[PDB]
């Protein structure tokens, strides 16, 4: 019985691979070779945020490209007015060890978490005029690695229990739970329409799930090490991922296979964060060697380097309008380029 | 300046927040950080409770010689350790508890200590080995029912050091077993250390009340070594 089911799974995997190779008719390098080079890009630090005590670990731009939320292991969330280098809000956190932070698109709510195993959601516009604990979501049996907002009443969280949970803030209950992942889930990304989402885990596997149906529609296994970051193409039909193997792989949902690989010999460290610009041609990926690299997504060549750092590039993100990029590091220093 | 009234008010709020952050930094830096790990068979929980008198992180404050100490325990996080251990970088010490009384699973704890020591992230952080459960180990060795020779074939060849100073009122067999365990752990720690980080093993018991003083002394020696490194003396 167990042997029969294992053999059936092996046969289904082989069928998957055969279908992929059947649709693996051509590579992007062959098609993209006729595209003009992006050329050298000179990105220089435009704004420095200094008021943090320890490692910065998470950051997400809201609907606007001005406000910036940052989370620091000193146990603090800081909302900065990026245009004016002003700390809009400072919030101490009950748990010093923080690793994730999410900004609601409307800006009325912020979320974060870490090793406390409970995701904390606060709000900025309380009638009292002060930040308060809006919600304390509990049930994940492992650290919270990432979290994202579908809307003000829905929140998606990924944890180390090999399970991801979509919660309702009104009732504070696990609205939906996915247990299909095998390894620890590290990062989470939201598709434009929000009807689908993609997650990445330490088993060298990325998985696509439906928000409502909640089944693993497709899986991607092209990495050889633990996956640290995930980001979806702006069109929402593709995504990119990076792992400790010192390489980046970009896959397409529609074809259900890998589309392109970005890497070079000199890089010998893991990946921290990956993101795309408004056009999607610029793929910005952080690194553990105190550097960040922006590559040509289509032609897969080194376009620019951001070396303004003293420690890990823990987090990096792009704005909605794509006017600038933010990068937070272990040295408690935030640098914004453009 | 060009800032409008409502911009200068925001700037004033920003400077107030900066001063508050300075105060929080002042409060934060005066304390020393400890990450405490061990197994269920290890006397972790009793050690934590004595120091006092589904959350994935447990915090414990304790003051020794007018010095504040954070103690952080991870109990609910899964067996996997290489991922969530990166968060605990820049911690002054790592207190690893080993059940010296337990012989069956001593090899697994030894392998765990090897893995933590070989960690690339924890390559400049000091480790304090608390070989807990010393009365139980004493009785187990004295009775003779369980022999460490079977589990560790080199214990037969191992000898009691002449330089060793046995504890008062200690039988030779208990001292030999304790020193053999400490010898194995010290041999593992020394390898790959290269002087970057130092290990500080100590014999500790469940009811022993010297844990605070021993931890303070080890975290003072660690600080002295670090300052030697930084102030251009070594």
């Amino acid at each position, epitope marked *: 019985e167990l042997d029969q089911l294992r053999q059936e799974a092996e046969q289904l995997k082989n069928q998957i691979r055969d279908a992929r190779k059947a649709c693996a008719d051509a590579t992007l390098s062959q098609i993209t070779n006729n595209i003009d080079p992006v050329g050298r890009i000179q990105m220089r630090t435009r704004r420095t945020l200094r008021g943090h005590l320890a490692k910065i670990y998470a950051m997400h731009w809201g609907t606007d490209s001005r406000l910036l939320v940052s989370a620091s292991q000193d146990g603090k969330l800081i909302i900065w007015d990026s245009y004016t280098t002003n700390k809009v809000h400072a919030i101490p956190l009950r748990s010093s060890w923080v690793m994730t932070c999410a900004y609601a698109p409307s800006g009325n709510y912020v979320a974060c978490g870490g090793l406390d195993n409970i995701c904390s959601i606060y709000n900025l516009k309380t009638r009292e005029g002060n930040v308060r604990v809006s919600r304390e979501l509990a049930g994940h049996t492992g650290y919270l690695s990432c979290c994202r907002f579908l809307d003000d009443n829905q929140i998606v969280t990924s944890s180390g229990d090999t399970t991801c949970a979509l919660w309702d803030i009104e009732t504070g209950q696990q609205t939906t739970t996915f247990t299909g992942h095998t390894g620890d889930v590290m990062s989470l990304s939201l598709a434009p329409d929000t009807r689908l989402f993609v997650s990445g885990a330490c088993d060298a596997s990325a998985k696509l799930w439906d928000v409502r149906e909640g089944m693993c529609r497709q899986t991607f296994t092209g990495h050889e090490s633990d996956i640290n970051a995930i980001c979806f193409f702006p069109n929402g039909n593709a995504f990119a991922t990076g792992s400790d193997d010192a390489t980046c792989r970009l896959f397409d949902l529609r074809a259900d296979q890998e589309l392109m690989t970005y890497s070079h010999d000199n890089i010998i460290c893991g990946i921290t964060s990956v993101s795309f610009s408004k056009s999607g041609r610029l793929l910005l990926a952080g690194y553990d060697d105190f550097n960040c690299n922006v590559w040509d997504a289509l032609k897969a060549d080194r376009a620019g380097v951001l070396a303004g750092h003293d420690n890990r590039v823990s987090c990096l993100g792009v704005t909605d309008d794509g006017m600038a990029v933010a990068t937070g590091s272990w040295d408690s220093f935030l640098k914004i380029w453009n | 300046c*060009t800032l409008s009234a409502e911009d200068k008010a925001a700037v004033e709020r920003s400077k107030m927040i900066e001063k508050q952050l300075q105060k929080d930094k002042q409060v934060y830096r005066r304390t020393l950080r400890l990450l405490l790990l061990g197994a269920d068979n290890s006397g972790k929980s009793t050690i934590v409770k004595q120091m006092r008198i589904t959350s994935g992180i447990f915090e414990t404050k304790f003051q020794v010689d007018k010095v504040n100490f954070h103690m952080f325990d991870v109990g609910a996080q899964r067996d996997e350790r290489r991922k969530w251990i990166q968060c605990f970088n820049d911690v002054t010490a790592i207190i690893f508890v080993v059940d010296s009384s337990d012989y069956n699973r001593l090899q697994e704890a030894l392998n765990d200590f090897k893995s933590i020591w070989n960690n690339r992230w924890l390559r400049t952080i000091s480790v304090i080995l608390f070989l807990n459960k010393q009365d139980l180990l004493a009785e187990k060795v004295l009775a003779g029912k369980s022999k460490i020779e079977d589990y560790f074939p080199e214990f037969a060849r191992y000898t009691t050091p002449e330089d060793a100073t046995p504890e008062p009122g200690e039988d030779p067999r208990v001292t030999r077993a304790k020193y053999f365990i400490r010898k194995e752990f010290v041999d593992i720690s020394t390898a790959s250390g290269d002087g970057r980080h130092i290990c500080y093993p100590h014999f500790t018991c469940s009811v022993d009340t010297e844990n605070a003083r021993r931890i303070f002394n080890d975290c003072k020696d660690i600080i002295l070594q670090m300052n030697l490194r930084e102030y251009n003396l070594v």
Partner: single-chain antibody
Amino acid sequence: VQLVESGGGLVQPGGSRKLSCSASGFAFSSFGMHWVRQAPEKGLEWVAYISSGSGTIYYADTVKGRFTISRDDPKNTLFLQMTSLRSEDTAMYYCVRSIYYYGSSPFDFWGQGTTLTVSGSADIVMTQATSSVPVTPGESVSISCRSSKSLLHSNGNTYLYWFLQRPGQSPQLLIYRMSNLASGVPDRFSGSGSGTAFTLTISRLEAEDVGVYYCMQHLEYPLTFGAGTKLEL
């Protein structure tokens, strides 16, 4: 949210008085406090402003060297000690909380006020052409107010605020920074304009939408108020 003020009463010419405002329900250390005076059957006049943490203190020309303001943060209290009171100072005095940051909404809460009885060069002249325009429920209305200087700043924010003093009540923020609608105010109310000419439109008038409407600037510290435009049932 609760601001209760006391200390208003009968005074003699030349004496001093002390107004105490207690605050409860909201943080007092993170909110700037404004003292505002309105003469009987007259418009609102700004007295003073004190920022958070006793950082910035600003008065008006007519009350310079006579009024003093202070804030007891632990007691969440505001003190206004005013000297050499005269017949020109009789008025209803309100304490107003304000918060300043990107996306903020200052002048959002007003105290009930205290009744005090005793016996322009550089300021922005906040004109209000309309004086008293009767209107009925179910009819859209609009009121325009001007300024001596183009209030638009390099920031892009036009610092124009619209308040409503319903009969026998304290003023209420309706619109901030010329277009942003305050929390809890109906969407009937809408504000628009350009640097030196602004307007407030109430889509479907109602009994609640009756009172004097005031238009204030926020560039110069004087924080001058508009003259007023009453509505009738």
